[PDB]
Structure formats: structure tokens, C-alpha cells
Amino acid sequence: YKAGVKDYKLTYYTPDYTPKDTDLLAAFRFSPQPGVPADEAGAAIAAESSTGTWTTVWTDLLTDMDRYKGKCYHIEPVQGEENSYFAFIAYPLDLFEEGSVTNILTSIVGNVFGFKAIRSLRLEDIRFPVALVKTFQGPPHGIQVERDLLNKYGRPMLGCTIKPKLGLSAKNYGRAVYECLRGGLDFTKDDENINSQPFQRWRDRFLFVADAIHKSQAETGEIKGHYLNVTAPTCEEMMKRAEFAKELGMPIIMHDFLTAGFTANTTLAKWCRDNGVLLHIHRAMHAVIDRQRNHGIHFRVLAKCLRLSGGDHLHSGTVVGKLEGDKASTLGFVDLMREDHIEADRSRGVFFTQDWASMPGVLPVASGGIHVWHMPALVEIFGDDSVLQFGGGTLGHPWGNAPGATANRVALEACVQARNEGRDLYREGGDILREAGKWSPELAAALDLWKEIKFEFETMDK
Amino acid sequence: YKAGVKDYKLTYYTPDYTPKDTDLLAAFRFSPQPGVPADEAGAAIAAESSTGTWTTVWTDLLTDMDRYKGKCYHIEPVQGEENSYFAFIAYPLDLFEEGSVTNILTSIVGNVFGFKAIRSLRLEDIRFPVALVKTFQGPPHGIQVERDLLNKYGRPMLGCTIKPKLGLSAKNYGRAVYECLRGGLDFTKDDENINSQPFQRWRDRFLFVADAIHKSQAETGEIKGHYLNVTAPTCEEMMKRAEFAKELGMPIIMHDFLTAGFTANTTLAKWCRDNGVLLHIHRAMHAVIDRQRNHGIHFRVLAKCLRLSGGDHLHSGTVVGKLEGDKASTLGFVDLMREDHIEADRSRGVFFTQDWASMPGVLPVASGGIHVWHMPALVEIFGDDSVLQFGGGTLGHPWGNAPGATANRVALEACVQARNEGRDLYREGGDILREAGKWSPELAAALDLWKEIKFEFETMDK
Amino acid sequence: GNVFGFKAIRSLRLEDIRFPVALVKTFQGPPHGIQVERDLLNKYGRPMLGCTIKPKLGLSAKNYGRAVYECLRGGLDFTKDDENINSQPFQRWRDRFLFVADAIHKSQAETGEIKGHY
Amino acid sequence: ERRFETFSYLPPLSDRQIAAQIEYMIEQGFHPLIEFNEHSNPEEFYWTMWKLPLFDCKSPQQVLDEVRECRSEYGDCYIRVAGFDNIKQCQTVSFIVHRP
Amino acid sequence: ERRFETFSYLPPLSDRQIAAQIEYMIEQGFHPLIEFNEHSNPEEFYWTMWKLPLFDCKSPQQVLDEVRECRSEYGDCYIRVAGFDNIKQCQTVSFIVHRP
Amino acid sequence: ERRFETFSYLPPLSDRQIAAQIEYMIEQGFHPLIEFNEHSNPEEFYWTMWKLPLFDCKSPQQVLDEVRECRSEYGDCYIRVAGFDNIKQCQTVSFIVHRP
């Protein structure tokens, strides 16, 4: 034993190492301070995450360090930028606890981001080995079971948000939901920040929404649901809300995964699997963590972590909407979400071959600032298995709510039929929309009113 | 009712408005795209957070919108930079749910960060009105009750971390803990990611640590404790670990707040108040969220949120250590943490006068890359009420563990006596340390070996 | 607590209490309030009506139910037990609850208006 | 006989009393609303709406014409009039105008 | 008006569009299936089947003839078709072809 | 060797340093207090008091004389000095002066 300070690069820089089918891999994009060699910085990144410390202690000799230490085995420069490099890091499996996402996040991204020798850092991708992914629970139901239970095939699902965000009593909330539902929609949702306020307590909202759901389902003849929010300050309160949601027979509830914490989300997923109620996940606060290009966490890693924790619906951007999303990255991580076997393709933002071992898929969701004219292009990008929610596309119809819902439903059906027959949506979308609106006045009114609005803004993340 | 797209600046720009003692204020620092007027952008930030939407809907007329709408009442430019402005925003109290931090975070920083018209955004401060702060539970014990229970006065508390990160089994963990306790230390901690691994299950670690603590306390004659980590995938597992921690009679446990979630943290704070076990909070992942200067959340807002949720110990940077921290901001938000009445002072990074209404204090903690020569200056900055943890400052002593602990304790006590007598620490620290090490060989050895290491690195956050 | 029993005071009477907002925000508040009650009971535009059952005591379970049913079918909305009726040797609480519930159900089915009883 | 909530024990209301009703409706800034429904169960809360609340109300004859149109197109259903308040967020007046 | 799941807002589909549906069925490898039922409750999942799925389908006229025969023998019942996938093991397309 | 909280690893404190400690105790408004006890268990909180806190402290010599008297009468016991605060309501200084 010899105490003192040691250089990192003499121990944690092994480019001869070969990854195994068991190890867990991660990719970092980093930019260091001037005068700092890249290899030393990569060694530091792999060092402070697994076992490293600024000086060597005697206890280091009591165990087999070489078996557990992380390793940095590839550093490369990215074209078009200076003092910015990709660093790949591998970890043995005995580093992590089985069946927990919190431990993985704390071990990987706990302290490295605050390093002084690094100007900027950003985690790009995570590869999950099969031996670890077999431990987790997976989504409570998946895609196939959800579709079978809700008895809906051949078309993307439709949804709508209740507006304004806050300020409605319980009975007016119920009336708005009932009007939106009877028009021809399938889902209506509470807003992200409605939990329980002095103006509207939760029990009354639940009761009135249940009554509206029952009446509309009896009237029309189609299984209709509604997302009841659950976000609560304590595990006990959330459990109580879930129990009451079950008692009334509602078929779906929602939860905010990032702002409530992965612990609460995992326990909610376990309970939902036990009692068989579909679970909806919102993606609040994501813009705090994935906005910039040089610092933060890219969304796809959060998507993989969530798919490990549990969830059926997941917000996934809008491409042409009012929230940030680039077409290439959106498609890449959507295919990351849904499929089972995905090969490496640097053009779509995926870095490693990932296999899920028959874990069911998670349905992506596009919502925010879309209207009728966005229907064709949207359907082209996502494919059939998707859920589209119109924020202002239904209530903003000048004739109330039901005309807006009917117009949305006819527009979506016409697009799915136009692609169904063999026509190209992108080149003929205007013709399809006009022909569809020829006979139904509500669709024509929506088309006439909402053809002047376009959101063309530069993408920050390039 | 008239539907359509409506510019924000006419409705959410009122500079005649005056804040009340009930409203909740927030400060944003933002940079917009070229061609976007600043006032319109500030109106967008205010509107999208409370009730805004990209098009008016009929339901907007069924409530008293003016009572609930957020308001932006001040936009100013910051000297030394271009296209960067401060925007202040006010919210009425009826907006938030009583006694929940998650709802506040989701309502404020939910969607605004992903806006097109904003190049970058960063929240700076939050003012909590008394009417809202009275609802929350507050820290389980505080400073005074903790000091009284642990019977320790006149000196900052001391601590150490077990090294290496992983690799030790249960019995050797206990052996290292016992050796470090008997030297003259007070607190030792499990390391952040140690929860339960294939090489070391949690029950054995708890049992052995309890046995070592009992033996050391019987031997020396001092109340000695140790943080047992609790971070678990589910609420049930964490509750079980807490119950077992209580059964053995250990007086302190630890938890990670950001990586587990505010819901779990709130329920843990409530339980530990009910059963009277001290709570220790770690600030993991904070580097992801506060590193940059233009995008993210400054740490002091998280500190206020934590002081609302519950916690006795809180990591607070090291100024001169191995992690990023500037002296001015560190002092400012430390005084924000501890004191009860804090007046506005833009020089220290505090923007609003905040009153806690006798809610007890939370002890700051400095840890990471410090050794003996850092003792004087450190004691000057923090004052008496603080807990200093030496990572490699105890086990790195070439004589084992107990000599290192004895040297650390003698150095700290000599500094506190030197300031106690009336001498100046900053100007004479070297002389005080040499005189202290004159008669205790362990302190002399530590001083001799660890005088060559300095960390002088440029601060990113300016 | 103790001020009212002082010697130097011949008479004392509290008149008003001001509750600061910071304290009133702590309490629970009424379970439902006015708006939610009106919405749940579906009654608007008129004051609500009620009645007491008389005499004070002396009625069995079935006569209690018959009186409540007769008064409810006439066009009232609420009927109430009397303050001191809790449980007596002549009329226990389970039978009274059962009979009042049956009468409420039958009257509500007959007339078509939501009806309740304290 | 099955009853129909408030104002349901009177002889049928005349048109002039309806006009006075509507004038008091608009006097304190309440806005009218028209609902029509098939069944009259007492456990159902929501009814089907007709158009939108008439925010630009200028005369009782306008709401009278609206009720006349409602009877013209859906005369085989129960038709009733409600009123909304924008400050207390709770409706206040409700009664049945057209019976089968 | 009562609705009947997908494609329940259009005027009745012509035969040529049904043929288009059928070649779309066979193009990606889905197989047809014919079901008939009396009630159209939304709380029921299973429907009565008609023979077996036509695995060796070779032309849309075959499916059209099968639907014609089903209408000929059980014309007093709702008749619908569905498509099956043997890879992901989940039906994908379902719509009503014979209303009452 | 058994230890007795802070200032218990230094060689024995001289009288001048104790006087400096006491004057710093009085400087910011903390008041002295004298306690004596027989046993030194670490699970016991309360100790036996001697007179009252000296609110009229005017010189360190007074507290030194009081400690001398305390040693004179009960010298066979551990004797220690504490300091009290009247603002935050929490003691701040505690060290052992007389060991047996």
C-alpha cells in the first residue's frame, strides 16, 4: 500500500478491451477545459462514476478492484466541432441492483456532471443488457393487450384536453367532458397541474367525470375513457386516489413520472399491473433536462428508463406542433420505444443494438398545438399505432365542442382511408381534406377557419 | 365569444400591478430569438405557465379568468450582456394545492422551458408567502433539537465516507467503520449508490454497522451515529428498511431526494418525524440541473423546496473542494438555508425578502476533496453550525484510519479554539496548524504529506 | 381558558375574533360548502325546505318511517331526527336507520325528486 | 304525479311571466342556456346543450325565439332553461318550459 | 345516432372501396375473417365466427362472395369482417359491412 | 481512554485560556452556568445545577472564583461549565474544567 495522488489515465484507459453481452455501456459527449488532454478527461469520467477518488486508500487493496472498476475504451472526435469528443464507457453487471432504476441513475449520472475538469457534458445513449432487462417488471399492459381491452382497431386513437387549464367547477368540468365525448372522440384528460385546489376538490371531479363517462357510453355505444390525474404529495394519498379510481370502474389513470419520482412511479406501475387499470404517463419538466445540445440528458435515455419502470402511454413531441422536436430524432427514439429489435443507426440517433426480450411496447403520444391541416403529415410519420390529442382543435370550433369532435374524427378517418386505399398522404393531403369536407359542414368550417396558422421556427437542438 | 389566435402582450403585460403579501413571485432569466420583442416573450412566459393557450375557447368565458391568470409585471435588461433579460412573474395563491411541492414544481416549470420564442431560460429565485409556508410540515427536527439530542456543542460536526465506492463485504465494512469511529470522529456514511448488490445485501450491512457503532460508543463514551442508506425502488421497500433501522435503535438515516422523487421524500420526512429519527438528504444529480449559467435551475430554489419538504442535513458545496461552487452564491444560499429573516441583497444572489415563520433550520454540509490544510478557511466561511466530511482526509493517513481521524479532530478543534481565543484564521492558519501539529505526531504527518495538493480551477457559473 | 375567572373583573364577554390568513390556510374547511352541495343535490332557484318529526320521543320505528314518508311525498325536501334521539329503550338506531332509508328510497322512486334525511 | 323540479306545482306559466323571468335572468348579469333531454330520471345530472350561451343577449324575445326554434325541431323532448353566473361559477335558476 | 366503431361516419362504402380494403388486407399478409352477431353492445368482446379464416385467399372476389353468402343465409344480423396478423399476433382492421 | 466531548483531546487547559474562554462567553451575551456530576455516561442528558446562571457577570474573575468554590465543596465530582443564549434559546459552549 502506497498512499498519495495518482493519475487516472494510467489505470482506466484500456482500448484493447472488448465489450461482452453482459456489460452495460454508456456514451458521453463532452467538452473539456483548454489544456486538458482528452484521454485524461475520459478516464476521469469513467473514474468518478464507479470507484475513483482523488487519492488512494489502504482499503482499496482489500478487494478485487479490477473486477468492479469501470472502463473507458473509446474516445473519438466529432466532425464539425472543436474540443468536443465522444467517450464510450463500460460497466460490469455486478455494479447495479436488480430491478431498480433509481440506483442505475444515481450510479451513472450522480457526480460526474459536476466535475471541474469538464466544460460541458451530455449523456447520449444507454445500452441495457438482456440479463438486466429480464429483472424489471415492464409496462403493466403494453400495446396489444391495451388494444384488445379497449376494442379499437385500424385507426389512431383520439384525445382532447380540457381548457382553460384551471378555473372550472366540478359540474362544468363534467359538462365539458360529456360534450367533448359525445361528439366522437375517445379520450379526455385532466391537465398536468390539476391535483386538488381550493376551487375544485378531487372527489367531486372524479364523481362527475365518472357520471359523464357512463352517460356518454350508454348513449353512443363505444367504450369511452378518461385520464384521471393522480399526482399526490405522499405514497398514501396516491394509493387512496388509485383505489377510489378503481372502485368507480374507470379504465385509465395518469401520472407525472419525472416530477413525482421514479419510486412512486414504480410502485404505481406495480399496483396497476396487480389491479389491471391502464396507466398513462406524462412528460412534464423534460424541457429542463433535454433542451440544450451541449449539457443535459437526451430524451431517449429517459424513454428507455421509463419503459423499464412501466407505462402504456408516453408523450413524444409533435414535430410540427408548438413543442420542440426534430423529425429525425423523433422517429429514431419512437422506433426505440415501440420495436423489439433495433440495430445501430447513427443517422437516427440510436447508438447501440438494443433487445427487449419480448417486453411489450409503449404507445407514443403527440399533443400540443395541432389542428385539422396537420392530420395527413402526422399520420404519415407515426404510423397507425399512435394517440393524437388536440389541445385547441376541438373546443375552438366556433360551434362549441361536439362539432369540433365530429370534424376531428372525420378528418382522421379520411386520412387513414386515403392511405388505406393506396394514395400518398404528403402530396395529396389538401385534396383529401377538401374532398372529406365537401359533405360534412363541420369539417369544412374547421378547414376554412384553421388554414392560416403555421408554426415554422428554427430548431435549437441540431 | 370570439375564437382565434390572440397575441399575448395585450393581456399579460401589466406594469401597474403591485405584489401583495399573499401572491407567489418568481424570477426568470431568459434570452429570446432574434426578431422577438422582449415584452411579448415575457408575456408568453407568464401566460403559458398558469392559464395560457394558443387559441381562445368558449369555456374561457365560463369562469373569472382575471382572478386566476398569472401576471408579468417587470422586464429589465442585465448589464454586460445582450438579448438577455430578467422577467418577474406573480401568481395568486388560489393557484396551488396546500402542502405539496410536486404540484408547485409542475405548475411553474412544467411546460414553459420548451418554448420556441426563447433561446434559453433559467429560473433564479422563488418567494414563498407566509400563508403557503404555514401549510407544509417543515424539517423533521431542525438544528436546535438535533444538537440537543446528540449532545454536541461548540464545534462543527465531523464525518467521513467509506472508500472505495464498492467492493467490501459486510464484515469488512463494519471493521472499517469501527476503526474510523474509535479514532475520535463522529459520523460516517454509506456511499450514494450502495443500496443492495449481489456482493453485499442490506440486512447484513445494517446489522454489522449497528454492532460496530454500539461497541465504539461503549468503548469511548461519545454518542456516535452512522447514516444508513434507504433509497429503494418502491415506497414499501423504503418503509421496510426504515422500520428495521428504527428497530436496532440507530439515530440517523439518509436519503437521496432528487433521484427518488419529492413524493417519496415527503412521506419519509413525515414518517421520520412521527418516529423521531434524524433525516439526512443528499443532493445527487444536482450537477445535471444547475451546472450551466443560461439554462437549468439554480440550486437555491431546490434548497428552498427541500427546506419546505423536510430534511436536517443538506449537502452545500465545498468552495475550495473538488466540486463546482462559487463563494458568493454559496454564502448567499447558505444564509437562505439557515436563517429565519433574510432581506433582499442582489450581491449574494437572493432576490426577495423571505420569511420562514419560525420553521426550524437545516444544517448545511461540506464534503468532497478536502484535507487538513483546508480546515481554517473552511471554518471561517461556514461558522460553528456545520458538518464537515472528509472523503480521503482520514483513511488516506499512511498509518491506517484511527490516526487519520485523530489528526482531523485535533486540527478542527485547534482551529475552533484559535478563532475562540480571538485570532484571525485566514491570516495565521499555517501557524495555527503547525503549532497544533507540534505535539501530536499524526497531525504533523498529515500536514507534511498533504501540503502539496491544491485545486485552483476556473468557475463556470459566473 | 382562565381569564373569565378573574377577581378584578365583575363581568367579561368576548365579542369578535380576527383570523389571520396564514392561520386560516391551515384548517380543513367545511367538507363540501355551498356550491358543491347545490350541484350534488340538483336544486336551484329556491330555498330548501325541511321539517322536524314530532312529538319529541315516543314513536316506534315503523311509525317514524310512515311519518317521514307521508311528509316527504307532499313536496318537501328534508326531514330530520330530533336533537336528543340517539338510542333509547323504545327505539334503537339500527331499525330507525333501516326504516328511514326504505322510506327515502320509496318516496324518491315515486315522485322523481332527489330527497334526503338527516 | 311525477314532478319536474322547481316551479313544477303551478298551473302552466304564461308567456308574460316567462318574459319577466328572463328579464330578471339578465338583470344581474346571468346568461341563459337551453337544454333538451328525453328522460327525466333524478340520478342524471348532465343534459344535452343547444348551441352556446347567448352572451350577446339584448332582449327577452331573442331567448323566446330560441325556445320556439327548440320546440320546432325537438318538440317531442323535455325542454328547459338554465342560467349561469360568471363570478360564482354556479348556476342559479332552472325550470321546465316545454313538456311532451 | 348509434355508432358502430371505425368507418361509422361515412355514407355506406361502395363495393370498389371494399375491394380496395381486401387487397390491402392481403398485401401485408393479414388474413380475412367473417363474423355475424345480433346485438351490438360495447361490453361484449367475442362474436360468432363463420367457418374458418380463408388462409389461401387468392382474389377479393372470394371474400366478396363469402360476404354475399353470409348475407344470404343470416341476413337479419349485423355482419362484419376483420383482419388477422400472424407475426405480432393481433388483429388490425375491423369494420362493419352489413348493417341491418 | 474515556473522553468527554469537545476540548477533551488537548492537554489540560491553562487558567489564562480558561479566562479567555469565559470572556468570549460573556462577549456576545451568553451567560455562564456551572454543573457537577458523579458519573459520565453518554446517555444521560441532565446534570445537577449550582446556584443560578450569573446574570450580573462583570468580570471573568467572578466565574473563576465560583468554579474554585465549586471545586472546594464538591471536588470529588466532575465539574463543567456551560454557556446559555437568550435569543436562539440553545446552549453553545460546553467543556470539562475539573476532572477527578
- DSSP letters along B45-88, please? HHHHHHT--SSB-GGGGGS-HHHH--EEEEEEEPTT-SS-EEEE
Instruction: Give the count of alpha carbons within 13 A of A396, CB side only.
Output: 23
Nearest alpha carbon to residue F9 among A2, B412, A193, C97? B412
Q: Which chains touch B (3 or more CB pairs under 8 A)?
A: A, C, D, F
Helix axes B402-421, B441-449, angle to 10 degrees: 90
Residues of B in contact with D52 (CB under 8 A): 1, 58
Q: Is D44 left (phi over 0), alpha (psi -120 to 50) or beta?
A: beta
- Asked if the C-beta of C114 comes within 8 angstroms of chain A's C-beta atoms, the answer is no
DSSP-derived 3-state class of residue A386: coil
**CB-CB: which of A151, A384, A413 is closest to E9?**
A413
DSSP-derived 3-state class of residue C38: helix
Residues of F in contact with B151 (CB under 8 A): 5, 42, 45
Is 3.20.20.110 the CATH number for B137-460?
yes
DSSP per-residue letters across A256-293: EHHHH-HHHHHHHHHHHHHHT-EEEEE-TTHHHHHS-S
Q: Which domain holds residue E37?
A: 1-100
Report resolution (Å) to 1 decimal. 3.9
Cell of A243: 383505489
Contact at CB, C44 and D3, closer than 8 angstroms: no
DSSP per-residue letters across B272-338: HHHHT-EEEEE-TTHHHHHS-SSSEE-HHHHHHHHHHH--SEEE---SSSSB---HHHHHHHHHHHH
- Asked if the C-beta of A406 comes within 8 angstroms of chain E's C-beta atoms, the answer is yes
Taking the C-alpha atoms of residue B446 and residue B441, their distance in angstroms, rounded to an integer, is: 9
Contact at CB, B54 and A233, closer than 8 angstroms: no
Q: Which amino acid is at B61?
A: L
Contact at CB, C42 and D5, closer than 8 angstroms: yes
CA dihedral sign, ordered A307, A309, A312, A318: negative
| C-alpha distance from residue A98 to each of A129, A132, D10, E63 (Å) | 12, 7, 74, 52
Q: Is C106 annotated as a binding residue?
A: no
How distant is the Cα of C39 from the closest Cα of chain A, in angstroms? 7
Nearest alpha carbon to residue F58 among F84, F90, F88, F32? F32
The domain tally of chain F equals: 1
Answer for the pair B53, B18: CB distance below 8 angstroms, yes or no: no
Answer for the pair B234, A270: CB distance below 8 angstroms, yes or no: yes
Cα Rg of chain D, angstroms:
13
Q: Is C66 exposed, middle or buried (0-12, 13-18, 19+ CB in 10 A)?
A: middle
Cell of A399: 360551434
| CB-CB neighbours of B174 under 10 Å | 21
What are the structural domain ranges in chain A? Answer: 9-136, 137-460
Residues of C in contact with D90 (CB under 8 A): 35, 38-39
Peptide bond into B164 cis (omega under 30): yes
Nearest alpha carbon to residue A176 among A417, A7, A405? A405
Residues of D in contact with A211 (CB under 8 A): 44-46
Name D19's Cβ contacts closer than 8 Å, sequence gap at least 6. D60, D61, D64
Taking the C-alpha atoms of residue B115 and residue B30, their distance in angstroms, rounded to an integer, is: 11
Taking the C-alpha atoms of residue A368 and residue A360, their distance in angstroms, rounded to an integer, is: 26
- Any contact of C with E, at least 3 CB pairs below 8 A? no
Contact at CB, B421 and F40, closer than 8 angstroms: no
Answer for the pair A393, A371: CB distance below 8 angstroms, yes or no: yes
Using the 8-state DSSP alphabet, how is residue A47 labeled? H
Answer for the pair D39, D2: CB distance below 8 angstroms, yes or no: no
CA dihedral sign, ordered B314, B318, B324, B330: positive
Q: Is A191 annotated as a binding residue?
A: yes
Taking the C-alpha atoms of residue A142 and residue A139, their distance in angstroms, rounded to an integer, is: 6
Taking the C-alpha atoms of residue A170 and residue B19, their distance in angstroms, rounded to an integer, is: 30
Measured between CA atoms, the residue of chain A closest to residue C33 is: A199
Best probe of the A interface among E2, E4, E10, by most A CBs < 10 A, is: E10
Q: Is A410 exposed, middle or buried (0-12, 13-18, 19+ CB in 10 A)?
A: buried
Q: B193-224 b/e with 16+ CB inside 10 Å = b?
A: bbbbbeebebeebbebbbebbeebbeebbbeb
- Asked if the C-beta of B64 comes within 8 angstroms of chain D's C-beta atoms, the answer is yes
Residues of A in contact with D48 (CB under 8 A): 182
Alpha carbon B35 to its chain centroid, in Å, reads 39
Taking the C-alpha atoms of residue A146 and residue A394, their distance in angstroms, rounded to an integer, is: 25
Cα Rg of chain C, angstroms:
21
Given the residues A6, A74, A134, A163, the one annotated as active site: A163
Cα Rg of chain B, angstroms:
25
Supply the CATH number for residue F16's domain.
3.30.190.10
Q: Is C12 exposed, middle or buried (0-12, 13-18, 19+ CB in 10 A)?
A: exposed
DSSP per-residue letters across C86-101: S-BTTB-HHHHHHHHH
Cell of E74: 343470416
Cell of A26: 454508456
Q: Which amino acid is at E66?
A: E
| CB-CB neighbours of D53 under 10 Å | 20
- Asked if the C-beta of C25 comes within 8 angstroms of chain B's C-beta atoms, the answer is yes
User: Which ranges of C5-118 would DSSP assign to H, the alpha helix?
Assistant: 21-24, 35-41, 61-73, 93-111
Measured between CA atoms, the residue of chain B closest to residue C27 is: B135
Cell of B99: 402542502
Name A446's Cβ contacts closer than 8 Å, sequence gap at least 6. A371, A372, A393, A397, A404, A407, A408, A411, A437
Q: Which amino acid is at A181?
A: L
Q: Which chains touch A (3 or more CB pairs under 8 A)?
A: B, C, D, E
Answer for the pair B268, A261: CB distance below 8 angstroms, yes or no: no
Q: Is C83 annotated as a binding residue?
A: yes
Using the 8-state DSSP alphabet, how is residue B247 labeled? H
Given the residues B224, B226, B282, B313, the one annotated as active site: B282
Q: Which chains touch D (3 or more CB pairs under 8 A)?
A: A, B, C
Cell of D42: 333524478
How distant is the Cα of C23 from the closest Cα of chain B, in angstroms? 7
The H-or-E segment that residue A75 falls in is: strand A71-77
Answer for the pair B342, B128: CB distance below 8 angstroms, yes or no: no
Q: What angle do CA A204, A209, A210 make, to 5 degrees?
A: 100
Taking the C-alpha atoms of residue B43 and residue B39, their distance in angstroms, rounded to an integer, is: 6
Residues of E in contact with A217 (CB under 8 A): 42
Taking the C-alpha atoms of residue E21 and residue E7, their distance in angstroms, rounded to an integer, is: 12
Best probe of the E interface among A385, A417, A439, A440, by most E CBs < 10 A, is: A417
Contact at CB, C39 and A201, closer than 8 angstroms: no
Name A212's Cβ contacts closer than 8 Å, sequence gap at least 6. A174, A175, A177, A178, A181, A226, D46
Q: Residue for cell digits 363495393?
A: E15
Contact at CB, D52 and B58, closer than 8 angstroms: yes
- The D-side interface with A (CB below 8 A) comprises 44-46, 48-49, 51-52, 89-90
Q: Which amino acid is at B17?
A: Y
Strands (E), A128-251: 157-161, 187-189, 225-229
Q: Is D47 exposed, middle or buried (0-12, 13-18, 19+ CB in 10 A)?
A: buried
Answer for the pair B188, B367: CB distance below 8 angstroms, yes or no: no
Cell of F56: 450580573
Q: What are phi and psi of B189, to 5 degrees?
A: -130, 145
Taking the C-alpha atoms of residue A159 and residue A181, their distance in angstroms, rounded to an integer, is: 9
Taking the C-alpha atoms of residue D31 and residue E5, their distance in angstroms, rounded to an integer, is: 37
- Asked if the C-beta of B63 comes within 8 angstroms of chain D's C-beta atoms, the answer is yes
Is 3.40.50.150 the CATH number for A9-136?
no
Name B372's Cβ contacts closer than 8 Å, sequence gap at least 6. B393, B407, B408, B411, B433, B443, B446, B447, B450
DSSP-derived 3-state class of residue C115: coil
- Asked if the C-beta of B458 comes within 8 angstroms of chain A's C-beta atoms, the answer is yes
Give the catalytic positions of C in this structure. 54
DSSP-derived 3-state class of residue A297: strand
Answer for the pair B368, B392: CB distance below 8 angstroms, yes or no: no
- Asked if the C-beta of A169 comes within 8 angstroms of chain C's C-beta atoms, the answer is yes
Answer for the pair B46, B107: CB distance below 8 angstroms, yes or no: no
Q: Is C2 annotated as a binding residue?
A: yes
Catalytic residue status for A163: yes
DSSP-derived 3-state class of residue B114: helix
Q: What are phi and psi of A326, to 5 degrees?
A: -100, 145
- Any contact of F with E, at least 3 CB pairs below 8 A? no
Taking the C-alpha atoms of residue E8 and residue E94, their distance in angstroms, rounded to an integer, is: 11
Q: F33-70 b/e with 16+ CB inside 10 Å = b?
A: bbbbeeeeebeeeebeebeebeeebeebeebeebbeeb
- The coordinates were experimentally obtained by cryo-EM
Taking the C-alpha atoms of residue A222 and residue A216, their distance in angstroms, rounded to an integer, is: 9
- Asked if the C-beta of A259 comes within 8 angstroms of chain B's C-beta atoms, the answer is yes
Q: Which chains touch E (3 or more CB pairs under 8 A)?
A: A
Helix/strand/coil percent split, chain B, to 5: 40, 20, 40
A with B: how many residue pairs have Cβ under 8 Å apart?
Answer: 302
Answer for the pair B239, B201: CB distance below 8 angstroms, yes or no: no
Q: Strands A85-91, A24-32: parallel, antiparallel or unpaired by DSSP?
A: antiparallel
Beta bridge partners of A4: A56
Name A114's Cβ contacts closer than 8 Å, sequence gap at least 6. B286, B287, B291, B323, B324
DSSP-derived 3-state class of residue A40: helix
Nearest alpha carbon to residue B275 among B241, B312, B243? B243
Q: Is B304 exposed, middle or buried (0-12, 13-18, 19+ CB in 10 A)?
A: buried
Taking the C-alpha atoms of residue D79 and residue D98, their distance in angstroms, rounded to an integer, is: 5
Answer for the pair F83, F72: CB distance below 8 angstroms, yes or no: no
Measured between CA atoms, the residue of chain E closest to residue A151 is: E45
The H-or-E segment that residue F81 falls in is: strand F78-84
| CB-CB neighbours of B71 under 10 Å | 22
Between positions 288 and 347 of A, the ones with CB within 8 A of B are 288-289, 291-292, 295-297, 322-324
Using the 8-state DSSP alphabet, how is residue A200 labeled? B
